[PDB]
Design a binder for this molecule. Structure first.
Ligand SMILES: O=C(NC1=c2ccccc2=C2C1=CC=CC2c1nc2ccncc2[nH]1)c1cccc2ncccc12
Length: 207
């Protein structure tokens, strides 16, 4: 396990999301589903030039998996996935530029719900999660786990968990007062409100 420091801008955005009073927390789910949809569109498009890119799995889907015992909500997709360089380097560049644009937009009067327009919608996970774990597998690299509970650092390690084929799992270790996002009726309500037209099957698992 390697430990990395967040740069100042993204660290400030994580604190803003964790500390600001903002009741409309449900938008995190739309943001993560949108990220999954974009990752699925990317692998699908690449497969039109190179069909062997789906040798790691033909199915293009999104699964929502609540676990009351573990207090986790997992968003699983079979999209393009992320390489180690994406996790450490490329996405750090996006986090910095997207945060700067978002903070500029907020100071003007924009809302936290607009975070996805700045490419950093993933960070809306911190509206509901104390810790976020990303398990990912890209065709050009091995399976990795990125993780952060904020506090200025994140970790990356090769993941020895169940092999994924290709894609990403965003595991939300929910805050104690955010367990409504484990309830079937609540998740169904949010998906119907914000994600009804996503171009991939979204399966809401139950317990
Ligand atoms: O939105 C996506 N992911 C991510 C973010 C989106 C924007 C910025 C940083 C993102 C990161 C995401 C996942 C894991 C780490 C990460 C990150 N690395 C960093 C290094 C240094 N500083 C800050 C950092 N933030 C995403 C990307 C590609 C395929 C996907 N598939 C499904 C769901 C999400 C994705």
């Amino acid at each position: 396990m390697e430990t990395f420091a967040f740069q100042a801008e993204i660290a400030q955005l994580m604190s803003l999301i964790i500390n600001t009073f903002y009741s409309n927390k449900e938008i995190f789910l739309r943001e993560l589903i949108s990220n999954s949809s974009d990752a699925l569109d990317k692998i699908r498009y690449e497969s039109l030039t190179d069909p062997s890119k789906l040798d790691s799995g033909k199915e293009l889907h999104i699964n929502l998996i609540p676990n009351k015992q573990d207090r986790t909500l997992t968003i699983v997709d079979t999209g393009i996935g992320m390489t180690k360089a994406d996790l450490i380097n490329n996405l750090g560049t996006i986090a910095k530029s997207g945060t700067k644009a978002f903070m500029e937009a907020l100071q003007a009067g924009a809302d936290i719900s607009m975070i996805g327009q700045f490419g950093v919608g993933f960070y809306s996970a911190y509206l509901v999660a104390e810790k976020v774990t990303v398990i990912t597998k890209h065709n050009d690299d091995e399976q990795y786990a990125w993780e952060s509970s904020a506090g200025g650092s994140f970790t990356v390690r090769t993941d020895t968990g169940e092999p994924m084929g290709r894609g990403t799992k965003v595991i939300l270790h929910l805050k104690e007062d955010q367990t409504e996002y484990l309830e079937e009726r609540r998740i169904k309500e949010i998906v119907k409100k914000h994600s009804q037209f996503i171009g991939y099957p979204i399966t809401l698992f139950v317990e």
